[PDB]
Amino acid sequence: AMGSMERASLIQKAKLAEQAERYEDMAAFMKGAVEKGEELSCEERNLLSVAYKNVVGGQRAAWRVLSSIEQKSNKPEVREYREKVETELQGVCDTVLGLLDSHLIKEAGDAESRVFYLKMKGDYYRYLAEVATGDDKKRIIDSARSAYQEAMDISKKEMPPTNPIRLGLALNFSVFHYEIANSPEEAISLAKTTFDEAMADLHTLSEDSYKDSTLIMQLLRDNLTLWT
């Protein structure tokens, strides 16, 4: 319902919604900006990703609380309510995946845009896989893997090992291996190799760039500590 607002107004409203911690509004403003059909800049892709990550982050946190309550329960109310939250999270992931496929990814020719969108595609199938039980849990898992793999192949060819999007991609792909694909050894090897290749490239960075790479390096280290 954002078709009558100017693209620049939608972006400015998304920034306002972020300051106000109104993330559903932020995501709706960013959806409307994407649907204007023009490619996003670096700053605009960041806004889109923050808005939906926060929205789905809330749904996933609630789904885990209800799932946990439900597990202990084995009336219909917790299962029904977990299902309602689950449907809503599924619709958010479908919305994000539809934006990526119509037509953010097809138009993304630079490495930083294409890898960014492919990471998001892997993330949103991974959220679908967190809740999936059907005939299509396996195809959802493999859609996540294939998006993250394509992103990894491009990033290793086109971006330095310290690039924050390449780092975040590997962090999440390693989480996918660990808790979705049940491949903890692959999760560990990916996080160790990523960390080590970034350490050896820190010397090339300005003080600003050094700070954004080391921040996600620390999350790689946190997971390695947790898992080993």
Partner: peptide, 6 residues
């Protein structure tokens, strides 16, 4: 804690 993603 909970593992990190970003």
């Amino acid at each position: 804690k909970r593992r990190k993603s970003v």
